[PDB]
Amino acid sequence: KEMPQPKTFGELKNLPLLNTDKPVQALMKIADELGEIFKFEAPGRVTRYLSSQRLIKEACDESRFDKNLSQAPKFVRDFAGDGLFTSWTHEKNWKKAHNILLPSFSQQAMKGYHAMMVDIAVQLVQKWERLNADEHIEVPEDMTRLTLDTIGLCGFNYRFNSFYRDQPHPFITSMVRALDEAMNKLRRANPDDPAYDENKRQFQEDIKVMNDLVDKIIADRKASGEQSDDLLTHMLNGKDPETGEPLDDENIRYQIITFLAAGHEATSGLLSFALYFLVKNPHELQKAAEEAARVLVDPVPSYKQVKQLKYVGMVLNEALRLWPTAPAFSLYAKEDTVLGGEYPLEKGDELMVLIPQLHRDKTIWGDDVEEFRPERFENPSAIPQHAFKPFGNGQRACIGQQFALHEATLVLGMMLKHFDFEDHTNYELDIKETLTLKPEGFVVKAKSKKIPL
Numbered sequence: 098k099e100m101p102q103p104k105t106f107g108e109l110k111n112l113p114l115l116n117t118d119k120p121v122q123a124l125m126k127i128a129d130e131l132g133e134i135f136k137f138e139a140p141g142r143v144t145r146y147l148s149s150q151r152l153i154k155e156a157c158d159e160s161r162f163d164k165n166l167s168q169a170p171k172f173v174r175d176f177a178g179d180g181l182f183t184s185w186t187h188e189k190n191w192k193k194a195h196n197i198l199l200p201s202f203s204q205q206a207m208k209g210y211h212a213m214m215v216d217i218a219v220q221l222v223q224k225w226e227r228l229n230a231d232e233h234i235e236v237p238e239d240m241t242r243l244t245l246d247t248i249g250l251c252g253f254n255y256r257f258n259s260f261y262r263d264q265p266h267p268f269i270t271s272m273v274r275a276l277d278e279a280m281n282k283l284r285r286a287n288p289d290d291p292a293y294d295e296n297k298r299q300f301q302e303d304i305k306v307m308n309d310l311v312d313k314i315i316a317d318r319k320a321s322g323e324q325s326d327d328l329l330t331h332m333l334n335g336k337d338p339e340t341g342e343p344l345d346d347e348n349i350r351y352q353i354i355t356f357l358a359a360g361h362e363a364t365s366g367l368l369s370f371a372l373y374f375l376v377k378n379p380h381e382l383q384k385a386a387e388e389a390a391r392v393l394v395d396p397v398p399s400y401k402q403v404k405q406l407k408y409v410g411m412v413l414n415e416a417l418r419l420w421p422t423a424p425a426f427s428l429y430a431k432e433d434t435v436l437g438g439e440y441p442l443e444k445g446d447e448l449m450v451l452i453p454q455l456h457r458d459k460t461i462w463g464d465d466v467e468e469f470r471p472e473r474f475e476n477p478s479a480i481p482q483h484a485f486k487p488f489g490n491g492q493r494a495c496i497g498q499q500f501a502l503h504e505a506t507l508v509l510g511m512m513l514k515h516f517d518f519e520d521h522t523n524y525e526l527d528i529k530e531t532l533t534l535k536p537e538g539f540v541v542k543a544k545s546k547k548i549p550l
């Protein structure tokens with residue numbers, strides 16, 4: 098078959114379609130119009146956007162297709178280097194670091210992180226316990242404080258102390274501002290224009306701020322010899338079983354910057370969208386609050402108790418189904434191949450998986466794809482293979498998935514145990530896009546249930 102293509106802009110082809118603050122929502126609208134596959138052209142590049150489970154299952158065959166670095170990740174590589182997220186599968190450092198870090202991210206390894214996750218979660222609950230009657234909560238802002246602080250403590254035993262601040266720690270300001278530069282670089286008609294000399298100087302400054310902190314903490318840890326429950330201790334001590342080599346200090350720095358840069362925002366967006374869906378769907382809020390009350394019977398949650406929050410886990414999977422917070426990933430054809438029996442591809446051709454549209458495939462999910470129904474995930478053996486992919490695919494799938502889901506389960510369970518929530522503004526969903534998705538402006542009021550910590 099011949100391939101559908103959205104509207105074009107002369108010699109700029111389709112490129113201006115992405116000159117928007119909300120490009121993935123734009124592409125989802127295009128997908129709705131054009132169907133399971135469409136071509137997208139820009140000066141010097143071409144990709145094909147996939148939306149159906151039928152085609153994405155094929156794209157996810159690792160014998161045929163491998164991870165490609167899409168446009169904003171190639172710029173993120175300027176500060177995350179050959180850390181796990183911005184390396185190619187075939188670079189030595191990718192596999193070395195994957196083999197070293199995998200056991201440190203396993204479900205079993207969560208038992209070792211649990212206490213530092215509860216440290217930051219208790220800080221969030223005390224913050225909200227201490228609001229006055231007429232105050233409200235800025236939900237994505239607080240979730241972001243929580244997720245940055247939790248990855249800082251678990252990643253490198255460092256406190257960003259985000260709940261002590263309106264202006265984040267300078268490392269966070271630099272990283273946030275670097276991620277924004279990466280995104281903003283994509284939308285520049287004249288990348289070399291002198292108007293951007295300032296953005297380029299600030300970008301180098303921010304890279305320097307990030308490296309200087311992380312390098313110093315690494316050096317401090319080597320100089321002290323201290324052994325903590327964090328990823329930095331694991332990286333200092335670890336050898337790749339296959340090569341026999343450890344990670345060098347530069348790459349350990351890239352991994353630390355990568356866990357913060359890749360993980361914080363997608364996890365804070367998940368928590369913010371799950372609370373959004375529960376305040377809009379009070380019967381599901383009640384089910385999840387009843388479960389948190391029945392299960393979280395102790396003043397702080399244990400690892401075992403967090404595992405028993407099945408309905409909270411169902412709520413978080415259904416929020417990932419609707420708004421997977423790292424919404425698109427890119428692949429390339431390893432050799433010439435035919436996609437879906439219809440679309441011939443040459444070696445090197447690019448594909449993009451649009452995960453919000455895969456999760457709205459009506460042939461898989463049924464017709465009510467916009468409705469929030471946690472019970473879709475009651476028994477996850479019902480879900481066909483390759484239908485639900487919020488954490489990507491295969492060996493290049495999110496290494497932080499058990500971390501994110503333990504964090505979000507813990508924190509949402511505690512939120513639901515300790516407070517009732519009110520959507521006092523009747524908030525209108527407005528999804529902001531960075532590297533990730535979140536509900537911008539989402540606010541609520543909490544009313545404490547007056548349960549001790």
Ligand code: HEM
Binds near residue numbers: 182359360489496500
């Ligand atoms: C709900 C929260 C999260 C979601 C939805 C999510 C989603 C994703 C997705 C879709 C990918 C694949 C990207 C691609 O193919 O280009 C990815 C990769 C990755 N994520 Fe996550 N992520 C989340 C949380 C985290 C956290 C908490 C961490 C770290 C503590 C993390 C670290 C990573 C890394 C290091 C990669 C690269 C893995 C590799 O290629 O070896 N993520 N994530």
Ligand SMILES: [Mg+2]
Binds near residue numbers: 378468469
């Ligand atoms: Mg309903």
